[PDB]
Design a protein around this ligand. Sequence first.
Ligand SMILES: [Ca+2]
Length: 223
Amino acid sequence: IVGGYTCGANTVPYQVSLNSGYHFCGGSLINSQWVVSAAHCYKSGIQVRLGEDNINVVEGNEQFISASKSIVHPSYNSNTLNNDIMLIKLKSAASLNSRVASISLPTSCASAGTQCLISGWGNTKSSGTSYPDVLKCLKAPILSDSSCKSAYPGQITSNMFCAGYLEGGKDSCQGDSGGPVVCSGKLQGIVSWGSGCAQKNKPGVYTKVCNYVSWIKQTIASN
Ligand SMILES: [Ca+2]
């Protein structure tokens, strides 16, 4: 996250770190056995780390649970990042408490101008590189579809939305991928893509979660 703030330990209790020997992507806990992330975060050998603040120190509220299964969306296109969403099932159920909690799925899509909370352990620099040890947070608004499409002509589908600041300086970034965009208490986005990070006229592009709720519910009901 570029231009963000230190969240505060376990203030974002649905935030997970995906670990394959190192932190590589974020995700969101949607019930005791399921995590939502980005399909472009796919890899084998995922361990899901819940209750994290400092990803490099064991502080005492973590739960480390191996994935039993990953399910990339059936229509994921890695070239366009259309349908950039994946479900991860945990080998055992997480213990839900004040530090480890699930986030609601939307029933209705989010509106332009809504301020959302984006979080992760991604790069904090735009140009140059610095990864944090503790969870960073960013408040960002949803941008109009017309502005989003103007920023990325010929690249935005109806399964994407833009959030952030056209002036630049505040954005999610590499390493934040897969993590949450929460608006009015609902998981409405997944950190997906963007041209660089925090660049002028290049906002972040997010997977539009509300278009996938049917698929998420059906998949969880069958696996
Ligand atoms: Ca830790």
